Amino acid sequence: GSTLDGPYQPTTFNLPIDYWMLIAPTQIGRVAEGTNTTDRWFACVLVEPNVQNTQREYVLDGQTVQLQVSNNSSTLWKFILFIKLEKNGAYSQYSTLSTSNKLCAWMKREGRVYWYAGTTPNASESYYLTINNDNSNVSCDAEFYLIPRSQTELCTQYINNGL
Ligand code: NA
């Protein structure tokens, strides 16, 4: 089998730059979130297949919020990436990952958070938001793995084909 660094237990930590955090939830709902403390609070949530347009509640940055979600695939899971831009603001949707594998991943580099988006087996790190704070903490509700940038090809492989 594949050999990855992890699984690590759910925790909050200063994710080092240049490592993919490959997150492996077992439950739908909130998966992980992070912030630069100033103008970016980002979060990903997991939505099961075959979900008609609806408002669900998630506790993001400690607050219970209602967000509109949907997943019109009968087979693929869907991670949704939400971001709010000020402490007291509302979250908007920025990216998605439709997947048969239920894994998502992001990396802090170049002042940005890169995120795997698209539809497996052809998801890629095509989306990023800007944080400009290398000490931005991430809080993860799921087990996760860390993959150095030298093995980005492996992260891509795991996202798209499973471990
Ligand atoms: Na949809």
TrEMBL record:
Residue ranges of domain Haemagglutinin outer capsid protein VP4 concanavalin-like in the record: 4-163
Domain of life: Viruses
Transmembrane segments: none
Annotated compartments: Virion
Spans annotated as Spike head: 4-163
Record protein name field: Outer capsid protein VP8*
Organism: Rotavirus sp
Included stretch of the parent chain: 64 to 224 of 776
